[PDB]
Amino acid sequence: NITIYHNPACGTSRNTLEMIRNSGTEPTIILYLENPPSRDELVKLIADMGISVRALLAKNVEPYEQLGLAEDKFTDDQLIDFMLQHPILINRPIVVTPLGTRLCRPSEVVLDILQDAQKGAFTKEDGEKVVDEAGKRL
Ligand SMILES: [Cs+]
Ligand SMILES: [Cs+]
Ligand SMILES: [Cs+]
Numbered sequence: 001n002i003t004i005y006h007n008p009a010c011g012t013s014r015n016t017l018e019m020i021r022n023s024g025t026e027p028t029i030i031l032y033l034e035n036p037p038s039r040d041e042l043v044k045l046i047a048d049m050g051i052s053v054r055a056l057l058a059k060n061v062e063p064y065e066q067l068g069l070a071e072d073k074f075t076d077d078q079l080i081d082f083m084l085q086h087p088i089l090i091n092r093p094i095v096v097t098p099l100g101t102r103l104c105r106p107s108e109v110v111l112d113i114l115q116d117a118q119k120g121a122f123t124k125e126d127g128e129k130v131v132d133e134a135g136k137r138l
């Protein structure tokens with residue numbers, strides 16, 4: 001049972017999706033930009049990821065810039081509500097499996113929570129080797 005909050009226009013997200021597939025399961029794919037999680041779901045993801053609310057913020061997207069979010073003037077709940085109102089602020093990809101939830105940045109973070117091993121060598125789309133044929137992380 002795997003879910004990925006995916007942005008097809010982001011290389012890290014594409015790389016993550018293909019690593020998931022290379023472990024042999026096809027995940028549930030949520031285009032968070034158009035189908036963002038609910039407030040309750042979003043709080044849970046953040047808790048399960050073990051990161052701060054602010055570490056989940058995508059920088060260099062228009063709401064981050066225009067809302068002044070780089071400044072330390074926002075509570076965590078304010079930041080969660082901005083994320084819900086402007087889903088492009090949610091950094092990507094988030095992946096949930098039976099073993100846990102991670103913000104998969106860099107994409108190979110996802111190897112921690114995939115239950116089955118990669119089924120063969122995996123190379124990122126830009127040529128960066130991740131795992132060889134033997135299954136060793138390079
Ligand atoms: Cs939802
Ligand atoms: Cs693992
Ligand atoms: Cs292998």
Ligand SMILES: [Cs+]
Binds near residue numbers: 011126
């Ligand atoms: Cs890259």
